[model samples]
Target chain A: ELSIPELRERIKNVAEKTLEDEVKSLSLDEVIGEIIDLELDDQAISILEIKQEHVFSRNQIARGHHLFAQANSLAVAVIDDELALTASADIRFTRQVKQGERVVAKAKVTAVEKEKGRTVVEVNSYVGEEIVFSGRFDMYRSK
Target chain B: ELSIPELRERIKNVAEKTLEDEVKSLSLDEVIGEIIDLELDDQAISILEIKQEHVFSRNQIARGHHLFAQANSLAVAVIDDELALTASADIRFTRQVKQGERVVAKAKVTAVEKEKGRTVVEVNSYVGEEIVFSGRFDMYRSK
Candidate 1:
């Protein structure tokens, strides 16, 4: 049952536990935090402002490894529960992130299977609405 | 205590046991298997062949991790039998590798402590005479 009211609670719970003290006071929800903000859910996605310190290799367009690492961390934020650690990660950088740019990521739970309690999360990073990097991370969570 | 004969014997054992059959076989203690024919001391230097299968995504090169992984594996080979596993690794890439490119990596064991061992491995990829890539990999071995 994809009810809107219940979906909001699920989103709130996932968001709060995900980014706690890391963020002084967090304000983000399921629908608002997700990549597409799927209408099936009523969660508000968390919008984060990019800080200069967050930049890896800040002055230059960082290497793909750094970009992918950041993207993967954001994807972890998108998945709410005590999910499994990232087992396999693959990222292809289409563009670079410049300093003073605010990037938003839409993390979507594309697949949830019970066999091995596997979860695949896809996050797309966008700088001012322009997609910069996309990646698929496989997480193994406990059932 | 440093001994070339003892070091040579150890390297032979590793080349035979560790690397999969798909990889090139080493003869004596030459770092590049006659490609460059430099007999390196037991400090930590070995060159690996870049088989065709190692190339992924045409230009993508093997994951940065793999280059260092093999180099890391090589570091483990050069150490005394008491070490357990590698605890920390830092590596830098100077170029990309293509399919069938023969990569000559010179791994040197720089430091060895009671509880930890440090090694520096340099990889230079060549199509033939022209170096395509160069890298320095640092490895730590835990005893």
Candidate 2:
């Protein structure tokens, strides 16, 4: 129905206005320009280049944690409060990312349980159009 | 039954013998000597000293990914293959680890599915006896 899309748009607008200044005035080491656009569909895209430091010396493959941080921090950024912390996450690395490759991570808020002080974020990272990593983050927040 | 412990001991002994040389000869940047003792109760403890490089400069708190790698790699180490890869994981960061603090990651092999090439591992990371991180890793292997 049209109702769902409209509600989504409404939620999207509010989230944008809420987090716009936060993202703009922001400078967090892991999250500066990497959080590209807040379409505020309650979603944001993170883009990172696989650097020498991000990989293992032998394979030149990016460490799994690098993907986690990219997705995790992006998930954390979508929260309205600075008080947000990741309580848990379910993640999958479907493929290895190599040096000189670009990883595009997409994070979206899937649920919010305020009374429980929990939110759920789903993040997927891709090198090209193929998904390389996926995660479900259970985030804790102070309302 | 006493049989359970005996089987465990047998399995542990073989596992230790099989992985001993691998762990001894380990030169992996993320692994190295941090994986201190492989008791091979199908378990291992990884000790990492948090450093400047492991933190976000603002907080001096160790980043979550560091804990994940410590745990993830230990989980990978238990597999008897150079072909083992992590397929998925469920992780929790229960506390913020400050720089200069030590993280001791304990990982145990919980299950194996040879037909599906999946192995399950449980990891708990502690800071001075306090649990700071926990994870369950689903490892993909070639048998």
Candidate 3:
């Protein structure tokens, strides 16, 4: 019953609604904390304080994956859109971090491919002045 | 003062004690369940049943880090003697897994340098018949 122009408009509206729902579905409170700053085109910075639960053994050093989660989630949060997921990552740990150490993860958009809906994000995490972990993530974004 | 032979024996005893303590210290009940089997030789095989707590959200999907932790800890657990720590890991996530899915992590001693006290462990984790995650870990072991 609808014309071609009206059909196109309906499809666009449906896509926009789906995207909004997906954005809200992600709960960042389970991962990273308050965002210090986020510039999708430039950089994204966030902070996390290592908790006792993050460690493997009681009161021992935190696991490497905890550090990676903080940084990887930041990479996802930095993407311009709501539906973004990590495709792959090349990560390194320069130093070990223990419980109670505060970590800061900073992400920068190194490359953007609009055609492929892909983005390359470089993330580095710091404990004090020392760099503890660093990663380059290839993110898949749905536009 | 002890003779050279006696001193070597004492060091060996100390190393054995440390290894025992390290094994007991790892309480993986919070993540993976009771390990089904352990074989440390040319390779290490460790299997665990995923629990609800391993998921990002309650009773939902498991986090990538949980899978990584399972495999990484197995890498540490497989060391024949002394305490081993993960120095670095080259890891990748192949697929997403949900709660209650059983995971198996198999590690192999791909390379070892006795003089340097360095070992390379390659780990591959699986969910049922499909591979979920894999990693190559550089481990530092105490003499």
Candidate 4:
């Protein structure tokens, strides 16, 4: 759809845009890429195409945090709640992602601890069969 | 001195500039903020001024990943090596960071496991006296 800059600009020109448009333009899906598949609170799969902005120009290697965001956001999304935020994450960058490659993150809810008001999600971001990123996110969910 | 876009634009128009300029324009400092105080591989203090680009339009709350990057990169920087990458990070988002606030991240090398070729760094990011983000980053160093 729209490039991130275009979306950001859409939100920036807030005078002409409605709050609906601004909210629509901002999402974990927007930040990472798009959610191509989802199973509600069970699992989610999102994809991000590695762009020039995602990489350091010299090596064309994707920034670690960008990769983390893809998985982190997906982990946050799979939680079934009105408000959810990341409390902690144990992250690993398995391999360097190059430009033009599409990174796909698959996140699954592993546990739900209502007593602690927390959920555990495991995410693995891959390029084909090889994983580029992985994380275990501990999320805070408000009931 | 220049904004992130200006620096990125300079790198984009790299025909006239030297390699030095391109390298200079890209840094952990550039990504997060400025390293106002540093003690080489022991500790580092960096500051980031949150802007609109860093926040969601509705609440003006800063993105969690941007706060993570400041701590993550600072943790990576405190290693004495030619090349380094983050192996893993255990992160906690303690509080919501509002736009227009300045975030300061203090990173210290807690344990260096040379036998394992890894270093452990503890980072706690703050807005004035309140803690916003904290992380324990395990880093890979190539000596």
Best by lDDT: 2
User: Mind giving the per-residue lDDT tens digits that candidate 1 earns over B29-92?
Assistant: 3112222332232434445566654444324344333454345445444544332233333233
Best by the DockQ measure: 2
Model 4 chain A poorest ten-residue lDDT run:
A17-26
* CA lDDT, candidate 2, residue A53: 82
Is model 3 an incorrect, acceptable, medium or high docking prediction? acceptable
Best by TM-score: 2
TM-score of candidate 2 against the unseen true structure: 0.78
Query: Each prediction's TM-score against the native?
Result: 0.36, 0.78, 0.73, 0.77
Q: Which ranking of candidates, highest lDDT first? A: 2, 4, 3, 1
Give a tens-digit lDDT track for model 2, residues B15-92: 987755564212456572276877542788879999998877656777677788888878877776655667899998
**Per-residue lDDT over A77-143 for candidate 4, one digit per residue giving the tens place of the 0 to 100 score:** 6666645678888899898899999999998888877667688899999999999889988888656
Clashing pairs in 2: none
* Weakest 10 consecutive residues of candidate 3 chain B by summed lDDT: B24-33
A24-141: candidate 1 lDDT, tens digit per residue: 1112221122232321111213334444543333143322333444444444444444433354555544556665665676666677654666667776777777877676766555
The C-alpha stretches of model 1 lying farther than 4 A from their native spots are A1-51, A54-58, A62-66, B1-143
lDDT of 2 by residue, A4-120 (tens): 989878866775675442442124665622767554326788899998988776678777778888998888777766566788999988888999999999988999887887889
Q: Under CAPRI classification, how is model 2 graded?
A: acceptable
Q: Give the alpha carbon lDDT tens digit for every residue of B1-143 in model 3.
A: 88999999999999997755444325546334345555542465667666776665633667666777777777776665544567777777787777788888877878886665677888888888788888887777655
Model 2 misses residue A44 by how many Å?
0.9
Model 1 TM-score (2 dp): 0.36
